[PDB]
Amino acid sequence: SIVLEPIYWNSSNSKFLPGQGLVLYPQIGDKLDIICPKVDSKTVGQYEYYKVYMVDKDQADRCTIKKENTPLLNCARPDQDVKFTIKFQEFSPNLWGLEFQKNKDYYIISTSNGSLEGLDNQEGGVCQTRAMKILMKVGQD
Ligand SMILES: *[C@@H]1O[C@H](CO)[C@@H](O[C@@H]2O[C@H](CO)[C@@H](O[C@H]3O[C@H](CO)[C@@H](O)[C@H](O)[C@@H]3O)[C@H](O)[C@H]2NC(C)=O)[C@H](O)[C@H]1NC(C)=O
């Protein structure tokens, strides 16, 4: 029904409010792209690395990820195009697809710290220091 504005997942994006992060209200059927940091020749900045995960409320609050969690976005090519389209669909086409329900809250965070060495860190990171997290209040407002 509508393509929401894309979310650029990087430390210079102001949509992430201090402390609170980003809060959205997507509706079933909408789509949203999460775009990995990309540096080329007209985009100034240092390589930024992140693993982005869908997690539960508790994990978001504590900025932690369990080793059973699998990234929905693995930003490991700071020099290329890497993005993930979240489709707020009720039914997934496969085992790895996402499914959403109306009037349900979903969270996305990264406990990576932006550096190559902290890509796999499972606690803190930008979730904790820069509020780089997203709350999606599906089917609401
Ligand atoms: C970090 O996130 C920034 C967004 O908060 C992002 O800025 C946005 O970058 C995109 C990609 O370059 C720009 O895209 C637009 O401009 C290009 C060039 O003309 C067009 O081809 C596209 O179609 C599109 O219109 C956005 O304009 C820009 N938005 C803002 C607010 O500046 C940074 O690029 C990200 N930085 C890194 C290092 O990934």
From Swiss-Prot:
Per the database record, which ranges form the Ephrin RBD domain?
A: 2-138
Extracellular face residues: 1-141
Q: What does the UniProt entry say about where the protein is found?
A: Cell membrane; Cell junction, Adherens junction
Give expression by tissue. Answer: Expressed in inner and outer pillar cells of the organ of Corti (at protein level). Expressed on lateral floor plate cells, specifically on commissural axon segments that have passed through the floor plate. Expressed in cells of the retinal ganglion cell layer during retinal axon guidance to the optic disk. Expressed in myogenic progenitor cells.
Summarize what the UniProt record says about post-translational modification. Answer: Inducible phosphorylation of tyrosine residues in the cytoplasmic domain.
Q: Which cysteines are joined by disulfide bonds?
A: 36-75, 63-127
Q: Which residues are glycosylated?
A: 10, 113
Origin superkingdom: Eukaryota
Instruction: State how it assembles.
Output: Interacts with PDZRN3. Binds to the ephrin receptor EPHA3, EPHA4 and EPHB4.
- What family is it from? Belongs to the ephrin family.
* Role this protein plays: Cell surface transmembrane ligand for Eph receptors, a family of receptor tyrosine kinases which are crucial for migration, repulsion and adhesion during neuronal, vascular and epithelial development. Binds promiscuously Eph receptors residing on adjacent cells, leading to contact-dependent bidirectional signaling into neighboring cells. The signaling pathway downstream of the receptor is referred to as forward signaling while the signaling pathway downstream of the ephrin ligand is referred to as reverse signaling. Binds to receptor tyrosine kinase including EPHA4, EPHA3 and EPHB4.
Q: What is this protein called?
A: Ephrin-B2
Full-protein residues shown here are 30 to 170 of 336
